[PDB]
């Protein structure tokens, strides 16, 4: 996260770290959406142009975390993955259209003060909240600057940006399965996700029921926190039929 702040303890109990076994290292972020299901970006797990294609046994998920590097004894839980599911129409060839994957855990994680799932939007919550100007929140342990590692989880709140602005800000072909967020060049405030935050949740708090909904997933962007550029997110509601489909099994 670029130009954000340290998260408070328990502020984001759905935040998940995808952890590499081999060189023990952070791969990506992710979110917990039930006791057995974790949501991430497809490109964290599968990216052929760079030869990346993870198997279950290569990874661990670390849930309940705050500190990036330290093993958080009695707090975090580390789970193995049963199964990885990539959206069948994830477009790694071109623009990362439908950048989304589900991971089924080997055993249900036990919820606690530091571990609790986020909600997934219904059509109505999506329609009411996913509007330009309205702000959400992005969290992760990725880069503090474009070219730099945080000791703890970082957080930033960002406004959803109008589709014409998003499209005009980039050379990439943007689809309906994407939205962008970030401040406009003059608006004065800054902030962005960056490498390492990938797969983390973009969430909004409902003013109707006080619950946090995950609306987006950290996907891509031209650099990090550049003026007139914006972070791009997988539109989770648009892909929810697929999410539900997989979970019905």
């Amino acid at each position: 996260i670029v130009e954000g702040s340290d998260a408070e303890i328990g502020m984001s109990p759905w935040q998940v770290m995808l952890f590499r076994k081999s060189p023990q290292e952070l791969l990506c972020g992710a979110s917990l959406i039930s006791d057995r299901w974790v949501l991430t970006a497809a490109h964290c797990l599968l990216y052929p142009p760079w030869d990346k294609n993870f198997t279950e046994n290569d990874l661990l998920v670390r849930i309940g975390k705050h500190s990036r590097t330290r093993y958080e004894r009695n707090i975090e839980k580390i789970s193995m993955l049963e199964k990885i599911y990539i959206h069948p129409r994830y477009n790694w060839r071109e623009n990362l259209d439908r950048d989304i994957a589900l991971m089924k855990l080997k055993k249900p994680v036990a919820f606690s003060d530091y571990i609790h799932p986020v909600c997934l939007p219904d059509r109505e919550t999506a329609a009411s909240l996913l509007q330009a100007g309205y702000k959400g929140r992005v969290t992760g342990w990725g880069n503090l600057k474009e070219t730099g590692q945080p000791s703890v989880l970082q957080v930033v709140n960002l406004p959803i940006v109008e589709r014409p602005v998003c499209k005009d800000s980039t050379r990439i072909r943007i689809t309906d399965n994407m939205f962008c967020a970030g401040y406009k060049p003059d608006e004065g405030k800054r902030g962005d996700a960056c490498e390492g935050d990938s797969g983390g949740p973009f969430v909004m708090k409902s003013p109707f029921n006080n619950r946090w909904y995950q609306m987006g997933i950290v996907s891509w962007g031209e650099g990090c926190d550049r003026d007139g550029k914006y972070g791009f997110y997988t539109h989770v509601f648009r892909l929810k039929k697929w999410i539900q489909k997989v979970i019905d099994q």
Binding site: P117, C119, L120, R211, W212
Partner: peptide, 27 residues
């Protein structure tokens, strides 16, 4: 479900330092 309600925040009726910013943004 019990989703989206944080044990250390909503469940205890405590607010985090910046959630207010998000509420504010719903013009």
């Amino acid at each position: 479900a019990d989703c989206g309600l944080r044990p250390l925040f909503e469940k205890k009726s405590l607010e985090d330092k910046t959630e207010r910013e998000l509420l504010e943004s719903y013009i």
